Amino acid sequence: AFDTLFDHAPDKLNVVKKTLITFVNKHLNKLNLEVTELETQFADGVYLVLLMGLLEGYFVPLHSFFLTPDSFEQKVLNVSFAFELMQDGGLEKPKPRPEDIVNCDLKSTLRVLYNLFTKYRNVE
Amino acid sequence: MNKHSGIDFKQLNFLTKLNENHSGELWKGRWQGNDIVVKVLKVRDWSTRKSRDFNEECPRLRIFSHPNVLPVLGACQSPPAPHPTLITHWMPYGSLYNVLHEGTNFVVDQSQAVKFALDMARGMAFLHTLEPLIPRHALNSRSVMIDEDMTARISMADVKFSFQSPGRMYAPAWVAPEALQKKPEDTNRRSADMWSFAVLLWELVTREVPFADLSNMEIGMKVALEGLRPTIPPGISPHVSKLMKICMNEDPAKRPKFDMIVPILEKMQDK
Ligand SMILES: COc1cc2ncnc(Nc3ccc(F)c(Cl)c3)c2cc1OCCCN1CCOCC1
Ligand SMILES: COc1cc2ncnc(Nc3ccc(F)c(Cl)c3)c2cc1OCCCN1CCOCC1
């Protein structure tokens, strides 16, 4: 379904990417964080964790994840934890493996972000 | 046989729903002649392990020995109950947060505020004499209840159980900076509670919600990493200013114990 928005409407795909860009900045700019590139800036799991707290109304204690991950393994653990926060919030288990996000798979990244956008687009 | 059967869920009379949120549902009800509140907990991936843990953690909350501590009256084990459930007495004025910030009929005066502070300090001093809890306790104005005679009581039902996600913090404005950043086992948990009391003092002085203009994520990140602190209120007595500053010491080891500030607050009472 989303895969058709991805592959066989590449100017719709670019339209979705700018929508997701505007959505994540609405929230992350509150922490003085700016997103300009969806292909890489969610790969280490940090902004996904911060975004979930901004969207669902909680702080994530810094001992619960790796704010500055120093290995592929810590980035995978961050993304897995963000996936757990997503399920806590009512989303079904995300389809991509956490390593797919860390590896900057654009489709996996956009699928996860799009499901957040579908759910939380009206949060202020 | 088990040492506790807990409260029989079938004996609960559910009267009216009070609230529902991420953590579960609150109901006003009745049980064995008591006016009660029931919390039905929402838990993802409930398991026998988590149920065993709930049943081991609840007995410690049944504290009947201090006027400024509100006990859990009991808990419903699940199974056989549909969901893990907590019961406490109905407190007619609700939480301290409700009384200070959502009070449409009266504004509590500062003599009552100083009495609330003394009540909370006495209850915390007593709790701090007990062996540590497995559930995480957090002192804030939502976890203090105001009884029918206006006595403030620490609510034992508001602990966070081992199966409730430690990764989601919903009232960070009251949490000590070190507790935003370090695992509980790496902090002095009793000194962290003094910071929370300092923020309660600030709330009693200003009658404002701390960091009301910020989201919980913004609060935790700015307090932990950018040194955000409550602004010391203008035009208060030097004595109150001094007490609030010592309770909010950046160094956890230099904060007073609750049993040290109880006599200070006693001398500040009107009667
Ligand atoms: C007088 O009202 C309450 C008394 C309460 N007395 C004791 N405990 C309460 N809450 C509580 C909190 C956690 C628990 F696990 C349990 Cl068992 C109970 C209480 C919650 C109470 O009210 C909760 C709903 C507060 N409303 C919600 C709607 O907007 C206005 C304030
Ligand atoms: C290191 O000693 C404590 C740590 C604690 N850490 C966290 N919480 C404590 N108590 C506590 C705090 C809040 C509560 F709601 C309840 Cl029920 C109990 C603690 C009580 C503690 O000590 C209680 C006094 C008796 N112990 C016994 C042995 O060594 C230390 C002193």
From Swiss-Prot, chain A:
Summary of subunit composition and partner proteins: Component of the heterotrimeric IPP (ILK-PINCH-PARVIN) complex composed of ILK, LIMS1/PINCH and PARVA; the complex binds to F-actin via the C-terminal tail of LIMS1 and the N-terminal region of PARVA, promoting F-actin filament bundling. Formation of the IPP complex is dependent on protein kinase C and precedes integrin-mediated cell adhesion and spreading. Interacts with TGFB1I1. Interacts with ARHGAP31. Interacts with the actin cytoskeleton. Interacts (via C-terminus) with TESK1 (via C-terminus); the interaction inhibits TESK1 kinase activity. Interacts with PXN/PAXILLIN (via LD motif 4).
Identification of the protein by name: Alpha-parvin
Cellular localisation: Cell junction, Focal adhesion; Cell membrane; Cytoplasm, Cytoskeleton; Cytoplasm, Myofibril, Sarcomere, Z line
Span of the signal peptide: none
Gene that encodes the chain: PARVA
Protein function: Plays a role in sarcomere organization and in smooth muscle cell contraction. Required for normal development of the embryonic cardiovascular system, and for normal septation of the heart outflow tract. Plays a role in sprouting angiogenesis and is required for normal adhesion of vascular smooth muscle cells to endothelial cells during blood vessel development. Plays a role in the reorganization of the actin cytoskeleton, formation of lamellipodia and ciliogenesis. Plays a role in the establishment of cell polarity, cell adhesion, cell spreading, and directed cell migration.
Domain of life: Eukaryota
Membership in a protein family: Belongs to the parvin family.
Tissue specificity remark: Widely expressed, with highest levels in heart, skeletal muscle, kidney and liver.
Limits of the Calponin-homology (CH) domain: 14-121
Full-protein positions shown: 249 to 372 of 372
Region named Required for interaction with TESK1 and ILK: 1-124
Organism: Homo sapiens (Human)
From Swiss-Prot, chain B:
Annotated phenotype, changing residue 81 to V: Found in a patient with severe dilated cardiomyopathy; uncertain significance
Keyword terms: Acetylation, ANK repeat, ATP-binding, Cell junction, Cell membrane, Cell projection, Cytoplasm, Cytoskeleton, Magnesium, Membrane, Metal-binding, Nucleotide-binding, Nucleus, Phosphoprotein, Repeat
Subunit field text: Component of the heterotrimeric IPP (ILK-PINCH-PARVIN) complex composed of ILK, LIMS1/PINCH and PARVA; the complex binds to F-actin via the C-terminal tail of LIMS1 and the N-terminal region of PARVA, promoting F-actin filament bundling. Formation of the IPP complex is dependent on protein kinase C and precedes integrin-mediated cell adhesion and spreading. ILK also interacts with LIMS2/PINCH2 and with PARVB and PARVG which may substitute for LIMS1 and PARVA in the IPP complex; PARVA and PARVB compete for the same binding site.
One of the GO biological process terms: outflow tract morphogenesis
PTM section of the record: Phosphorylation by PAK1 modulates ILK subcellular location by promoting its nuclear export.
Impact upon substituting residue 182 to A: Remains almost completely cytoplasmic with little nuclear localization
Family that this chain belongs to: Belongs to the protein kinase superfamily. TKL Ser/Thr protein kinase family.
Tagged with keyword Cell membrane: yes
Outcome following mutation: residue 39 to A/M: Reduced interaction with PARVA due to destabilization of ILK
Localization per record: Cell junction, Focal adhesion; Cell membrane; Cell projection, Lamellipodium; Cytoplasm, Myofibril, Sarcomere
Tissue expr: Highly expressed in heart followed by skeletal muscle, pancreas and kidney. Weakly expressed in placenta, lung and liver.
Chain positions found as Phosphoserine: 5, 65
Membrane topology per record: Peripheral membrane protein
Motif Nuclear localization signal: chain residues: 182-190
Binding site for Mg(2+): 158
Designated name of the protein: Scaffold protein ILK
Organism this protein belongs to: Homo sapiens
GO cellular component, one term: nucleus
Domain Protein kinase: 12-265
Gene name per UniProt: ILK
Notes concerning its domains: The kinase domain is likely to have lost catalytic activity but retains ATP-binding activity. ATP structurally stabilizes the kinase domain and promotes stability of binding to PARVA as well as focal adhesion stability.
Molecular-function annotations in GO: ATP binding; integrin binding; magnesium ion binding; protein kinase activity; protein kinase binding; protein-macromolecule adaptor activity; signaling receptor binding
Effect of residue 168 to A: Reduced interaction with PARVA. Decreased focal adhesion assembly and reduced cell migration
Region PH-like, annotated ranges: 2-31
Described function: Scaffold protein which mediates protein-protein interactions during a range of cellular events including focal adhesion assembly, cell adhesion and cell migration. Regulates integrin-mediated signal transduction by contributing to inside-out integrin activation.
Positions contributing to ATP binding: 19, 21-23, 39, 89, 91, 98, 160
N6-acetyllysine sites (modified residues): 245
Lineage: Eukaryota, Metazoa, Chordata, Craniata, Vertebrata
